[PDB]
Structure formats: structure tokens, C-alpha cells
């Protein structure tokens, strides 16, 4: 029952498809300084999620 | 103490008699330094502060449409350009030194 | 009073996007 | 299980404020925060949109976003501004200046750190986050710019979580911005690869509801914002209330998005009758399914005859039987096969929720992935090309650091999007 | 100036008196909290 | 039948009081 | 345990209202003190004029 | 917070500021002493002190003591700060060089000093509002110097210049074309949005709509104050489409040089004929685009409209706004440039304009003020340029400027840059 | 009886707020099944 | 388990004054020295901070150190000034002159003998002394140099007692001493090898707390020091009162110091809530952990996102269960794996005291040995070397007797410390 918070599992593969061990989490990351107009997003360069047909489970 | 070492990045303190009956001293202006936060510290703020991003210099990416001249009129010689003794000085450099967020 | 350049007075009803999917 | 809401820009903040008014309606939450709901069905899933407090009150799980403090001012001083958490209010010293570049790279970048802070706490303080919701307009400066910055900046940190945008799409006839094509394109190319669902709301349809459907004497932004708010409440009523055929935002996305880039939808609300004509309308399942596909009740101004329906979603609220709703909804396809995609059987998915909105017999929210969206995308692309052709207001964007081929890449993305729309429109078996 | 000083001083005196009256009025209108408890108190006689 | 009579009663009550408010406008 | 946390919450809410009242009083004290400074100023002005 | 610093320069700027501030006090309920009788909406224009007094965020400049002494001896003497109300020693004598090089240069530093005091007092500044006239000496020279110094001092902060250009055939000074053409440099480089308020159009408007056989500078300044109040009511008060100064300047300025924008107001009608009219949104919007219903003497039909920003106030509704705009689009006597099909910006505020008691405006439920960038603006610029060509063809009155401290290359550069602006208007108005 | 919310004084409460799967407005257990929460 | 306290400098004197006020309030000890508490729980372990007299007076076990009698007069005239023992007030005629050399060599030495005498008397009056606590500022003259001299002497005299220190780290924005770099450099290379654990306070971060979170309009130094006093109470609550999982200073030192030279901790308090946010707030373990690990809540102006946590301790107080304090403490560990060091599992250690501070349901004090304090060390060391190159203000220190080699080795050791923090920050398994 430990580490199940934020994931679709009443009881605890690590825990579930959702990441229960992600590195960023609550603290965040110094991203406001890194965002800049010089570097940007190109054609079909959005993050690869399950909705976009990308098997992130693997 | 020579002007062209003392005023590398700031406008000269143009002396003007009015306001005084004796020797003029100077008057401060609102110009701000580019954002230079000390490295690694949290964005620490005691009270509401004027954001430097709202005061980015106009000479940032001013286009050099005229043959290599970001400045448009002769009024740069009385606004941006100052003759610091034996040297000439311009604030169009600050546009290159700062970022789009007014960061050095 | 500036010069009056002629202008066609076009007053027409503005009913627009009138469509209906066939049900029943 | 929970949806965390974000409002961006003047339009987004106003729409979200009156949307939270609507949510407090059927969750029985006072402006102060105290719950006086008459039934506990309003408290059953109040955690989806509200986070409880020690005093028995509930806080919207919403973060506010605007370089202009004026919209926060109006929202907080309004009737339901008591409800919002104070620290979630994030604002700067100067407005966006109606510039996507300023809202996305210069003024928004130095401000989005706190936004990430607040949204991350609001996102990981819940038991199981179902998704993210954003409300903004694509023609604005901080609603579009900072909104898309938030969207792209949250997508990477929460890839598996569903994230949707209630984009209030602009139009030249109601153009209150001349940088409208620039902002719309720069926002939409980000939303294409950064949003699971990007539902579109159009001001011309909003106002044509106020005349041709409502006959209102003095229609206002309050009425328009309540239309958008009712859309927002209907799209997620099934999560908050029980129903015969439950659905969630993931199921809606699966049933409405056939291909990853095909996530822009028509919207519509029903029942909507003028206050003087509500006597004579026999409000029933047939009448609601007629009003779904009636022009007077669509939330975006485009002609569906020129296009084809890939998929649609019908979220019904109220006490009904599935027996007549499913047969009606197949009935419409049977005789409108000339306007529906053939190679997909049963293009429309229905969902039934028992609890209806307060003061309504029965409601229905219509979400349509129609292929007529390419018409309006072409319309905005033509003006974007015309403006980009002559540096038309281009220097404002380029002086904030954006490179000139950003616009070329955005227009290439839009051209690919409309080409895909057209080729899935005319694709045959 | 003297009259201004006397009027001001009397007015701050009145305001301080109102603050003192508010402070002297009590704010314990419910059961006193029992903050001094151990978890061992769960075991009972 | 009686239940839906009461339902229509509720609908008409809301609608006509809203009409009264509009005439007050 | 419910009445226990409820009684503590009564105490917390009532001390919050107590601090709210004293904060109103000290804020209006600050306003009055500024006003009396202004009265001194707007008396010394005519003092200097005379 | 959410404020804007008002700067008034010269004779015209000072009377415009007096009218503006009496109007603002009427709006926000501050007596001339400076006290009151969520009312903090005044914070955008008046800084509030702990005493409860509200000092306007204004700065008066004039090289001649008479006008500022008039202000200091008027009804609003206690309203204004003793500082930030600078008085000059002797006037610029209708000389741009006098106001820009040899006399204005030694008080521009005090100007920036008090402006910086205003800036540090304020916290959410959106920009500066510089009211002046380019026809005169002080308002041209010292105004140009102040604007160009503010450009480097405050960076990319908005600077809306409400300027009274010389009118076509109504004139006050013979060196007016010189002063206008010279000040056009700074009004072109160090000003995001410049608004024409020439006296001729206001005179015809008062004569034909306000039914006043004898209006004067008092009524003209009343109208200018009404226009500025209508423009900034979006940030002053709450409204349907809240728009900021930068928010509308970005949409009114297509090119860095192409930023001069004409203005108009509606409905401007006397009380005698005001109750005889359906003062509806469509009616007022149509009256806006009337060539005689504006505050600039230039026929808008002689050029391609580029961008119109409309400021609606009162019980105005967005669909009446939109219907009026659709009728305007259908009425193609006024046509938009091909590369700006949108061409419209809308800002709706819920506060009707409070009339000035003792004024000539009538109380109206709704009002509209439109500011347009259009290529028809080239008419007045070309007329001023031709007057400059006639005067400079044989060096009339140039000796005054030169002996007071400006080069002849400056005159030639002024004429050449104005010719470049002439060509640019027509280039951007050309079809794609 | 007058409902707690002033908005719902003109509405039907018991028939409207009742799931089709399921009349007292109160569900059986709060802290155990649905209203389980901190505090 | 006695904790004999000492306060040096005016900064330390005010901090200790408010700390003793808080301790006396929490133990029910009124200023005249009597006891009128409502329970014997706070009388059972009152000997940790209060020494009994024949007449029932409970005098603080505190030693007051200052070269200026003005601060001594201020603390004596304070609300609790009559509580302290009269002869424990030790002061000199000439002030420290804001000079580390003056406070450590020429003026502190002539009075450190009497200070050691009184400290020895207080320590030997105890049954089983747990250790010494010091409160001081590293930017002052007698707070820094004289405090370091005291720490060295007590290190030599009682090696096995735990030496806890509350150092007020100066920062350039607050900076109110031009020789803050000199004083901090000269005090850090003493605190490193003489203090068992040294936790830091920055006025920047205190201002951040009462601006962003408390939103206080005019918070004086008393309100500023209330937070640090509350944390001083919370670190020893486990000694003063029983609880589910007890702890003490020896346990905290052994459990948070993996390497003897890494004993500088970022510290913070929770809950802290503004007047407007009290309604939209809550006293639960979830919110405690959220605010505890909130970056803005730390009372040190270092951003944890640029560093990693060696170890940390949560001194929870109040009636709370072990599930809510273990589930979520492991949850934060899991979700911030990039910010918690891998080669030491279970970075966070939780202790629970069952007597919460009065006026609050439950609280927690955070003691974190984050590797981001190297940023503070590097910044003030860079200031030190910038001042040292030109021999700025070194004539004072050299005329008071010090040599340049002392400064050189001080900065050498300090650069060693920052390198040690960085190396173990970037070290892998
Ligand atoms: N609208 C308006 N314009 C004015 C007013 N007073 C002066 N002007 C304008 O000022 C122009 C003449 O310039 P000046 O008399 O020199 O006044 P100025 O522009 O302030 O220049 P200085 O007198 O040197 O300060 C005229 O063409 C008017 O357009 C006024 O009260 N209202
Ligand atoms: N439905 C609705 N739309 C709005 C509202 N306010 C603004 N909009 C739309 O938003 C667009 C302009 O957005 P804007 O306020 O400039 O966004 P911002 O600049 O980022 O704050 C226009 O096309 C309006 O139609 C509102 O209250 N309701
Ligand atoms: N938090 C807090 N800091 C203080 C207080 N008094 C002084 N300081 C800090 O102590 C530093 C200066 O110390 P200083 O007075 O020179 O120490 P001393 O010379 O030994 O008495 C400044 O940076 C202040 O921020 C206080 O009451 N509370
Ligand atoms: Mg004059």
C-alpha cells in the first residue's frame, strides 16, 4: 500500500503503468531559464505519449 | 576618473544649472541593470519589485535597416551616443549584451 | 461637410448558417 | 480521478470564473466555500474539482494565469472570487501586450516558474490525477502564448495524463485583434502536438446563439461565458455524477480521436430555446438530438455540409433510457450517411449520466471531430500568409527573440493539418 | 500646532483605549482544548 | 404521468419567473 | 475523536477571528497615526505661513 | 497598481492636462483639495497617501511660468504636488532648437528626475501619456528630448504621444511646419503610438455637432480629455474586453515607422440635439467613420485603412459592436489594406463617460472612441512637408534655429525623413 | 422544506438527485466509502 | 538530557530572547519564574532548559554574551527579561566594533574566561548534560568571532556533548555589514571543525516566508525571530516531551551527518499561513509535508532544485498517525529521486512528538543537509576573495593582530567545503 499514491492501483512491475518513481515530482526543475526562442518545437516533435501511439509502457 | 573609463555602460551625468543657484551636481535616472541573479539561489523577493523584463532596452534587436546603423536619426548623438572625452560611446551595445528577458 | 462620394446603401437581412441535419 | 483546471488570459480567466460558478451550482458550494448541497450526490465526487479544507469548505483545484492583473481583479472581486485559493493567483507587473511572443518567451517565461510550482502542487496533492484542463483564447497574447507554454511545459512532466484545451477560437468578423492570425497559428501548432483534446469555441456561433437561439435583448460576455461553462460542465459531468453508461475524458479522447493529430472538435449545447419559445417545444430525446445537429446550437461557426464527421460524442444528462437515445443516434447516421465518414462504423459514441444540470429536464453536450475544421483553418492560414507576406506586425514578434522561420514552421504544420483533414475527408474504401 | 497636537494625542489615546477594551474582552467561548495528550493514553483503566 | 406533470410544472415555474425578471429589466 | 478535532478547530477559528479583529484595529490605528501626522503637517504649514 | 504616468508639455499639453485631471477627478470623486467626500479604481491615476489624499500621477512642464502659475492658482492647487509641477524660466519662443538644445536640455534632467519619482512611487506602470503640441517650441523640442530620454531610461515601456499637429488652413505660428517636421524625428523613433489632435477638426466638430457658435480652447481640451478618458477607461474600470495600452499599441502599429494614428469620438453631441437621436451602437460606430466626425483633418477615404481600435463604453453590448463592425465592413467606401483582413480591435468597458458639469458634452448611455492607423494619414504629413519645402526653399526663419543651436543638416534630414515617411505610407498602402 | 441552497428552492430535489442504479438524500456511510477523507 | 543555551551578539541575543519566550510559554513558565501550567507533562522534563531554585523559580540555563551593554539592557527590559539569572549577564565596556578579529582575539579573550566559568557552572549543575546550543550571526563582530571562540573552548572542554549552533548567514541583498564576507569566511572555518551541527538562517528567506506565505505588512524582528525560535523549540520537542518516535540532538547528528565535515543544514518551519489564506488552508500531515518540502519555505536562500539532499529530518509535532507520516515521506522520496541522493537510501528520517505547540494542531521542523548550501558557501567565498584581492578592510583585522595566512587558510578550507559538497552531489553509485 506504499508508493501507490498518484497511480491507478489500490494495491501495489514496479507499481503500475503510471510512474510512481518519477524524478522531477514536486520540486520541479529550472525550466523558466531554459525556455528561449532560439530553441523550439519542430514538426511532430511533441512529447511521445500513449495517445500519440507511442508505447511508453515499454 | 576619466569619463571613458568611468561611464563604460552608463550615460554621463549631464550638468545643468537650473534647479540650483550653485554648481550642479547630477540627477539620477531610472535605468536598471540587466538581470544578473546570483547563481543557484532561490528567486528570493522581500517585497514587490520592478521587473527588469518590462524595461528591456529598445536597442535589443532594433533592425539595422540603414547601412549597418541600428540608430535611425542624428538624435542618437544626444540620446544614445555620448562623446566621452577622447572616446565615443553608444548604448546600442547593451542591446547585444542583454537577452530578450533583459538578462546579461 | 466633406465631399459625398456615392456609396451603395446595402441593407439586407443577415440570416446566416441556417442548416439542419435530417432526422425523423 | 481528478481534473485540475487552469485559466489563461482575460477570456480564459473570465470563462473559468463563471465555469466555477456553474460547478458550485451543482456541487452546492457557497461563494465563501461552505458546502450546503441539498443531496450528497453533490459531495460524492466533489473531490474531482474541489479540494477539501479543515472548516468543511472546498477549494477549486484551479490555477489562474494572466500577465494582466485586471482579470484576476475582476474574478476575485466578483460574486465567486471568494472561492479561489489566493496563492494560485499568479500575475506579473505588465500585461502581455496582446503578443504571443511576449506571452510565451519574454513575459511568460519569467513568470511560468511560479505557475509550474502551483500547478505541480495542485496536481500531485490529489489521489489519482485524471487530467489537466485549460481555458484560454488563441487570439490573445497571454491566453494563447502563456497557455501553450503551460501546455507544452506540463505535457513532458505528465505524459500519461490527459490534458485538454477549451480554446476560444477567433474569427475575423469578431476580430478584436489584428495579430489574430499570428497568435492563432503560433498557439495551434503547439496545441497540435501538445494536447490530447483541443475543443474549439467560436464567438460568432456564441452570439448567433444569443440571437437566433435565445432572442436575448442584451446578451453579454456573462451569457457567452456561461455557454462555454455549460460546455465544460457537460464534457465532464460523467466523472462527477453516476450514469447508466459512464465515460471519462480518456474514453472520450479514444472515441473521438482516430489519428493523433485529429484532436480538434466541434461543440454544441442543448437544450437552448428562446425564453418566449420554450412553451411550444416538446423537450424530449428526439428534440435534444435534433438540437445537437441543429445549426442554432453549435458552438463554432463552420459549415458541416462541406465536411464529414469522423467521430462524435453525445454526453446526455438526466433521467433517460438508453433504448431511445441509441436508436435515435443511429437513426441520424442512417439518413445522414452522405455527411458521415463511411469507413468508420458508428461514428458517434453516447454516454448517459443521471444527474441533470440544475433547472433542466435533460441536457446534452455534443463534441464533434468534424472535418469541416479545415475550412476555418484554411481561412486563418490565408490571412496568416497575407500578414507574413508583408512583415505585417511581424517586428513585434521578432523583437522578442522569435526567429523568422518559426512562422514558416507553424504554417507548414497548419498546411499539413488541413491536408490530412482533406485526405481523410475524401478517403474512400 | 498645539491644538493639533492635543487633538491628535487625545485621539490616539481613545483608539488605544478601544484596543485595550477589545483585548480585555475574552475569546474563549468553547471547550478548552486538551493539547497535552500522549498516544499512550489510548490504553485505559 | 403525474410525475411528468410535476416536472413540467417546475419547468414552467422557472421559465415564467425568469420572464417576469426580464420584464423588470 | 471527531468532537476533539472539532473543539480544537473551534479554538483555531476563534483565535483566527481574534487576530483578525486586532489586525483591523492596528490597521486603523496606522491609518489614524498617518492622519495625525498629516494634521501636524497641515498645521505647521499655516504656522510657517503666518 | 495598473497605473499610467501622465506627462504634459507646453501650453497645449498643460491645458489638456488640466482638462484631463478635472475629468479624472469627476470620474473618481476626488475634490480639488485632494480627498474623498472598492473605490480604489483611482489608483491607476492617483497615488494614495496614508492621510487618505490622492495625488495625481502627473508631471507638468512648460518653459514659461504663466501656465503653471495658472495651475497653481486655480481651483486644483491643493490637488497637485508642489514638485512634479515644474516651471521654466523663459519660453521656447516657438523654436524647436530652443526647446531641444539650449534651454530644454538643462531641465530635461529634472523632468526625468520627477518622472522617476513617479515611477518609483508606482508599481505596475503600463506606460507614459505625453500630451503636447508639435506646432509650438516647448512642446516640440522639450517634448522630443523628454521622449527620447525616456526611451533609453525606461526601455520598451509604452509612450503614447497625444500631439496637436498644425491644422491644414487654421494656423497659429509661422514656424509651425518647421517645429512639426523637426519634432517628427522623435515622434517617429521614440513613440510607439502618436495620436493627432489638430485644432481644425475639433473646431468643425464643435461647430457642427455641439451646436456651440463660440467654443474655445477650453472646449477643445474638454474634448481631448474625454477622448483620453474613453481610451484608458479599459484599464481604469472593469469592462467586457479589458485592453491595455501595450495591448492596443501592438495592434495599431504594423511597422516601427508606421505608427501615427488618427482618432475620433462618438457620440459628441450637445444636449439640445442629443435626446433627438437613437444613440445606438450602430449609429455611433457609423458616426465615427464620418470624415467630419473625427478629431483629425484628413479624409479617411483617401487612403487604405490599416487598423481601427474601438473603445466602447457604457451599456454597449458586444453584438451591437459586432453588427456595427459588420456593417462597416460591408460599407466598402472605407477599405482595408489587403494584408490586414482583420483590421479591427475591440475594447468594451462598462463605465459610461461621466460628463464634465458646466461642459458642452451631453450625458450618454454609451460612447465610442476609435483610433485608426490608415494610409489616408499621408495628407496632413504631405501638406506640412510642402509648407516646410516652401519655407526652407530659401532659408526663411532658419537663422533663428541655427543661432539658437541647431544645424542645417538637421533641417535637411528632417525633410528627407518626412519624405521617406511619405513614401512608406504609400508603399504599405500599395496592393500586394 | 426549504432547501439549504437558495438556488434549489424552485427545483425538484429528491427525484432529480437520485442515480438510476439506486428515498433519503443521505447515502449510508460517509467516512468509509465515498466521503473518506483526511481530518 | 540538558541543553545549555548561549546567545552571542545582538542577533543571537534577540533570537535567544524570543526562543526563551517561546520555551517559557510552551512550558507554562511566567516571566517572574513561577509555574502555572495546566499539566505535569511540561513539568516532567522542564530541567532540559530550566534550572530549579530553592524558591521554586525556574531560571533559564542560558549564557548571554555581548560586548555592548545596550543589547543586554534591551533583553533585560524585555517582557521576559527578569527570567534570566542576574549574574549570567556578562558584558564588556568596549563593543566588538563589527570585527571578527576584535571579537575573537583582543576583546573576546579578555571576557571568554568569565563566559567559560559561568558555562562550566551551568553545565556541572546538570545531571546528564546532552550538550550546548549557541545562537549567533556570522556577519557580526561578537556574534561571529566570539561565538567561534566559545565553540572552540567548549569543544576542548566537553568533547562528547552535542554542539548545536544557529548561525545567521548573511546575504548580499540584505547585506548590512561590508565585512560580511570576512566575518563569514573567518567563522565558517571554525564552525566546520568545532560545531557538531550548524544550521543556518538567511534574512532573505525569512523575508520570503513572511512575504509569500505569511504576507505580513510590517513584520518586525520579533516576528522574524518567532520562526527561528519555533524551530529551536521543535528540534528539542522530542527531548522535552514524550512521543511515538522520540529523538534527541545526538540522534539527529548521527542520522543527518554522514561525513564529519558536512554538517550545515537548511531549516524551515510548517505550517505557516497568511491571514487571507487561513480559510483556504488545512492542518494535515499532507499539507505539512507539502509546505515542509516547498522550496520557498526553507529559511536558507538556496534553491534545492540545483542540489541534492544528503539527509533530512522531520520533527513532526502533534497527534498524528504513522501511516500519514510514512506513506507521504516515502512518496516524496520516490517522486523526487533526482533530488534525493541514491547512494544513501531513505534520505528522510521522521520523528513524532505528541505535544504540539500551543495555537496549532500539528507542526513540523525540517532539518535538511542539502548539498545546495555549497552555493551559499561559494557565493560568500567569491565575495571574500573579491574583497581580499584588494586587501579591502584588512587593515582593521591586521591591526587587531591577525595575519594574512589565517584568511588564506580560511578561504582554502571554505573552498574545500564547497568542493566536498559538489563532489558528493555529483557522485554516483
Ligand atoms: N487643443 C489645444 N491646442 C492648443 C492649446 N493651446 C495651444 N495649443 C496649440 O499650440 C499651438 C501653438 O504653439 P504654442 O503657442 O507655442 O504652444 P506650445 O505648443 O505648448 O509651445 P510653447 O508655447 O513654447 O510651450 C497652436 O497651434 C495650438 O494648436 C489649447 O489650449 N488646446
Ligand atoms: N466567450 C468569451 N470570449 C472572450 C471573453 N473575453 C475575451 N474573449 C475572446 O478572447 C479573444 C481575445 O483574447 P484576449 O483577452 O486578448 O486574451 P489575452 O490577451 O491573452 O488576455 C477575443 O477573440 C474574444 O472573443 C469572454 O469573456 N468570453
Ligand atoms: N533574524 C534576525 N536577524 C538579526 C537580528 N538582529 C541582527 N540580525 C542579523 O545580524 C546581522 C548583523 O549582526 P551584528 O549585529 O553585527 O552582530 P553583533 O555585532 O555580534 O551584535 C545582520 O545581517 C542582521 O540580519 C534579529 O533580531 N533577528
Ligand atoms: Mg508657451
From TrEMBL, chain B:
<protein>
    <submittedName>
        <fullName>Uncharacterized protein</fullName>
    </submittedName>
</protein>
Automatic annotation (TrEMBL), chains D, J:
<feature type="coiled-coil region">
    <location>
        <begin position="407"/>
        <end position="429"/>
    </location>
</feature>
<dbReference type="GO" id="GO:0005874">
    <property type="term" value="C:microtubule"/>
</dbReference>
<comment type="function">
    <text>Tubulin is the major constituent of microtubules, a cylinder consisting of laterally associated linear protofilaments composed of alpha- and beta-tubulin heterodimers. Microtubules grow by the addition of GTP-tubulin dimers to the microtubule end, where a stabilizing cap forms. Below the cap, tubulin dimers are in GDP-bound state, owing to GTPase activity of alpha-tubulin.</text>
</comment>
<comment type="similarity">
    <text>Belongs to the tubulin family.</text>
</comment>
<keyword id="KW-0547">Nucleotide-binding</keyword>
<comment type="subunit">
    <text>Dimer of alpha and beta chains. A typical microtubule is a hollow water-filled tube with an outer diameter of 25 nm and an inner diameter of 15 nM. Alpha-beta heterodimers associate head-to-tail to form protofilaments running lengthwise along the microtubule wall with the beta-tubulin subunit facing the microtubule plus end conferring a structural polarity. Microtubules usually have 13 protofilaments but different protofilament numbers can be found in some organisms and specialized cells.</text>
</comment>
<protein>
    <recommendedName>
        <fullName>Tubulin beta chain</fullName>
    </recommendedName>
</protein>
<feature type="domain" description="Tubulin/FtsZ 2-layer sandwich">
    <location>
        <begin position="245"/>
        <end position="382"/>
    </location>
</feature>
<keyword id="KW-0479">Metal-binding</keyword>
<keyword id="KW-0493">Microtubule</keyword>
<dbReference type="GO" id="GO:0007017">
    <property type="term" value="P:microtubule-based process"/>
</dbReference>
<keyword id="KW-0460">Magnesium</keyword>
UniProtKB/TrEMBL annotation, chain E:
<protein>
    <submittedName>
        <fullName>Uncharacterized protein</fullName>
    </submittedName>
</protein>
TrEMBL record, chain I:
<protein>
    <submittedName>
        <fullName>Uncharacterized protein</fullName>
    </submittedName>
</protein>
Amino acid at each position: 500500500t506504499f508508493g501507490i499514491h498518484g497511480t491507478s492501483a489500490v494495491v501495489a512491475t514496479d507499481a503500475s503503468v503510471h510512474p510512481s518513481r518519477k524524478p522531477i515530482g514536486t520540486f520541479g526543475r529550472e525550466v523558466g531559464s531554459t525556455v528561449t526562442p532560439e530553441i523550439f518545437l519542430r514538426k511532430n516533435e511533441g512529447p511521445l505519449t500513449a495517445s500519440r501511439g507511442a508505447p511508453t509502457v515499454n | 576618473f576619466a569619463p571613458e573609463e568611468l561611464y563604460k555602460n552608463c550615460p554621463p551625468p549631464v550638468l545643468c544649472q537650473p534647479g540650483y543657484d550653485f554648481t550642479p551636481i547630477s540627477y539620477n535616472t531610472f535605468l536598471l541593470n540587466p538581470q544578473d541573479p546570483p547563481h543557484g539561489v532561490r528567486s528570493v523577493q522581500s517585497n514587490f519589485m520592478h521587473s527588469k523584463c518590462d524595461y528591456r532596452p529598445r536597442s535589443y534587436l532594433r533592425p539595422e535597416e540603414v547601412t549597418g546603423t541600428s540608430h535611425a536619426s542624428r538624435h542618437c548623438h544626444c540620446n544614445e551616443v555620448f562623446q566621452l572625452g577622447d572616446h565615443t560611446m553608444d548604448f546600442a551595445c547593451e542591446g547585444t549584451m542583454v537577452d530578450h528577458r533583459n538578462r546579461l | 461637410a466633406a465631399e459625398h462620394i456615392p456609396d451603395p446603401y446595402n441593407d439586407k437581412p443577415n440570416r446566416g448558417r441556417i442548416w439542419h441535419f435530417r432526422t425523423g | 480521478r481528478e481534473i485540475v483546471s487552469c485559466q489563461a488570459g482575460q477570456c480564459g480567466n473570465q470563462i473559468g470564473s463563471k465555469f466555477w460558478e456553474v460547478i458550485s451550482d451543482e456541487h452546492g458550494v457557497d461563494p465563501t466555500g461552505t458546502y450546503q448541497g441539498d443531496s450528497d450526490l453533490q459531495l460524492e465526487r466533489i473531490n474531482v474539482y474541489f479540494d477539501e479544507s479543515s472548516g468543511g469548505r472546498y477549494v477549486p483545484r484551479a490555477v489562474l494565469m494572466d500577465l494582466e492583473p485586471g482579470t484576476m481583479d475582476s474574478v476575485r472581486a466578483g460574486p465567486y472570487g471568494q472561492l479561489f485559493r489566493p496563492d494560485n493567483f499568479i500575475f506579473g507587473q505588465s500585461g502581455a501586450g496582446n503578443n504571443w511572443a511576449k506571452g510565451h518567451y519574454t513575459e511568460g517565461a519569467e513568470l511560468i516558474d511560479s505557475v509550474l510550482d502551483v500547478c505541480r502542487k495542485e496536481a500531485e496533492s490529489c489521489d489519482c490525477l485524471q487530467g489537466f484542463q485549460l481555458s484560454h483564447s488563441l487570439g490573445g497574447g497571454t491566453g494563447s502564448g502563456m497557455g501553450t507554454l503551460l501546455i507544452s511545459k506540463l505535457r513532458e512532466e505528465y505524459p500519461d495524463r490527459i490534458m485538454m484545451t477549451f480554446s476560444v477560437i477567433p474569427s475575423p468578423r469578431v476580430s478584436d485583434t489584428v495579430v489574430e492570425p499570428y497568435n492563432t497559428t503560433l498557439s495551434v501548432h503547439q496545441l497540435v502536438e501538445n494536447s490530447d483534446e483541443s475543443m474549439c469555441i467560436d464567438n460568432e456561433a456564441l452570439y448567433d446563439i444569443c440571437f437566433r437561439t435565445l432572442k436575448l435583448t442584451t446578451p453579454t460576455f456573462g451569457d457567452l461565458n456561461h455557454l462555454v461553462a455549460a460546455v465544460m460542465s457537460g464534457v465532464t459531468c460523467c466523472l462527477r455524477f453516476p450514469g447508466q453508461l459512464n465515460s471519462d475524458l480518456r474514453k472520450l479522447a479514444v472515441n473521438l480521436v482516430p489519428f493523433p493529430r485529429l484532436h480538434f472538435f466541434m461543440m454544441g449545447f442543448a437544450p437552448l430555446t428562446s425564453r418566449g419559445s420554450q412553451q411550444y417545444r416538446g423537450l424530449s430525446v428526439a428534440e435534444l438530438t435534433q438540437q445537437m445537429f441543429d445549426a442554432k446550437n453549435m458552438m463554432q461557426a463552420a459549415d458541416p455540409r462541406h465536411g464529414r464527421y469522423l467521430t462524435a460524442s453525445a454526453l446526455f444528462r438526466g433521467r433517460m433510457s438508453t433504448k431511445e437515445v441509441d436508436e435515435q443516434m443511429l437513426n441520424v447516421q442512417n439518413k445522414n450517411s452522405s455527411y458521415f465518414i463511411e469507413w468508420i462504423p458508428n461514428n458517434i459514441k453516447s454516454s448517459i449520466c443521471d444527474i441533470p444540470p440544475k433547472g433542466l429536464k435533460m441536457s446534452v453536450t455534443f463534441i464533434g471531430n468534424n472535418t469541416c475544421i479545415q475550412e476555418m483553418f484554411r481561412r486563418v492560414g490565408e490571412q496568416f500568409t497575407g500578414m507574413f507576406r508583408r512583415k505585417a506586425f511581424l517586428h513585434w514578434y521578432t523583437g522578442e527573440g522569435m526567429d523568422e522561420m518559426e512562422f514558416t514552421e507553424a504554417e507548414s504544420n497548419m498546411n499539413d493539418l488541413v491536408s490530412e483533414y482533406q485526405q481523410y475527408q475524401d478517403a474512400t474504401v | 500646532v498645539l491644538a493639533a497636537l492635543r487633538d491628535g494625542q487625545a485621539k490616539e489615546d481613545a483608539l488605544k483605549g478601544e484596543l485595550d477594551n477589545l483585548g480585555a474582552t475574552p475569546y474563549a467561548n468553547g471547550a478548552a482544548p486538551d493539547t497535552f495528550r500522549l498516544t499512550s493514553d489510548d490504553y485505559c483503566d | 404521468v403525474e410525475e411528468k406533470k410535476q416536472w413540467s410544472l417546475q419547468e414552467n415555474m422557472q421559465l415564467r419567473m425568469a420572464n417576469a425578471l426580464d420584464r423588470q429589466r | 475523536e471527531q468532537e476533539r478535532d472539532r473543539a480544537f478547530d473551534d479554538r483555531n477559528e476563534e483565535v483566527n477571528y481574534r487576530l483578525y479583529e486586532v489586525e483591523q484595529k492596528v490597521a486603523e490605528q496606522r491609518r489614524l497615526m498617518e492622519k495625525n501626522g498629516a494634521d501636524f503637517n497641515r498645521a505647521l504649514a499655516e504656522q510657517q505661513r503666518r | 497598481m495598473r497605473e499610467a504616468i501622465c506627462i504634459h508639455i507646453g501650453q497645449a499639453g498643460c491645458q489638456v492636462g488640466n482638462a484631463c485631471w478635472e475629468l479624472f477627478c469627476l470620474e473618481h470623486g476626488i475634490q480639488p483639495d485632494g480627498s474623498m467626500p472598492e473605490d480604489d479604481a483611482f489608483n491607476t491615476f492617483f497615488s494614495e497617501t496614508g492621510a487618505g489624499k490622492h495625488v495625481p500621477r502627473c508631471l507638468f512642464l512648460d518653459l514659461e511660468p504663466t501656465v503653471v502659475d495658472e495651475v497653481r492658482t486655480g481651483t486644483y492647487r491643493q490637488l497637485f504636488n508642489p514638485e512634479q509641477l515644474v516651471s521654466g524660466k523663459e519660453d521656447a519662443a516657438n523654436n524647436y532648437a530652443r526647446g531641444h538644445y539650449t534651454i530644454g536640455k538643462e531641465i530635461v534632467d529634472l523632468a526625468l528626475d520627477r518622472i522617476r519619482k513617479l515611477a518609483d512611487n508606482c508599481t505596475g506602470l503600463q506606460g507614459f501619456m505625453v500630451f503636447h503640441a508639435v506646432g509650438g517650441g516647448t512642446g516640440s523640442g522639450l517634448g522630443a528630448l523628454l521622449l527620447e530620454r525616456l526611451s533609453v531610461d525606461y526601455g520598451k515601456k509604452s509612450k503614447l504621444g497625444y500631439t496637436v499637429y498644425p491644422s491644414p488652413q487654421v494656423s497659429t505660428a509661422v514656424v509651425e511646419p518647421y517645429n512639426c517636421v523637426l519634432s517628427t524625428h522623435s515622434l517617429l523613433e521614440h513613440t510607439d503610438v502618436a495620436t493627432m489632435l489638430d485644432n481644425e477638426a475639433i473646431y468643425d466638430l464643435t461647430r457642427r455637432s455641439l451646436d456651440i457658435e463660440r467654443p474655445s480652447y477650453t472646449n477643445v481640451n474638454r474634448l481631448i480629455g474625454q477622448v483620453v478618458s474613453s481610451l484608458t477607461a479599459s484599464l481604469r474600470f472593469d469592462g467586457a474586453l479589458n485592453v491595455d495600452l501595450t495591448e492596443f499599441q501592438t495592434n495599431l502599429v504594423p511597422y516601427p515607422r508606421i505608427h501615427f494614428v488618427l482618432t475620433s469620438y462618438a457620440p459628441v453631441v450637445s444636449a439640445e440635439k442629443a435626446y433627438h437621436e437613437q444613440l445606438s451602437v450602430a449609429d455611433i460606430t457609423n458616426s465615427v467613420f464620418e470624415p467630419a466626425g473625427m478629431l483629425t483633418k484628413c479624409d479617411p477615404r483617401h487612403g487604405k485603412y490599416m487598423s481601427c481600435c474601438l473603445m466602447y463604453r457604457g451599456d454597449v453590448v458586444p453584438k451591437d459592436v459586432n453588427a456595427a463592425i459588420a456593417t462597416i465592413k460591408t460599407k466598402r467606401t472605407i477599405q482595408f489594406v489587403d494584408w490586414c483582413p482583420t483590421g479591427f480591435k475591440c475594447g468594451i468597458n462598462y463605465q459610461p463617460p461621466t460628463v464634465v458639469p458646466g461642459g458642452d458634452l451631453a450625458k450618454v448611455q454609451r460612447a465610442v472612441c476609435m483610433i485608426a492607423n490608415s494610409t489616408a494619414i499621408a495628407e496632413v504629413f504631405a501638406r506640412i512637408d510642402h509648407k516646410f519645402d516652401l519655407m526652407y526653399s530659401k532659408r526663411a526663419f532658419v537663422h533663428w534655429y541655427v543661432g539658437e543651436g541647431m544645424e542645417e543638416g538637421e533641417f535637411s534630414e528632417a525633410r528627407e525623413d518626412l519624405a521617406a515617411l511619405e513614401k512608406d505610407y504609400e508603399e504599405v498602402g500599395a496592393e500586394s | 422544506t426549504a432547501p439549504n441552497a437558495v438556488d434549489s428552492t424552485l427545483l425538484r430535489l429528491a427525484p432529480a438527485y437520485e442515480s438510476t442504479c439506486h428515498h433519503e438524500m443521505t447515502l449510508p456511510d460517509k467516512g468509509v466509502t465515498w466521503g473518506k477523507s483526511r481530518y
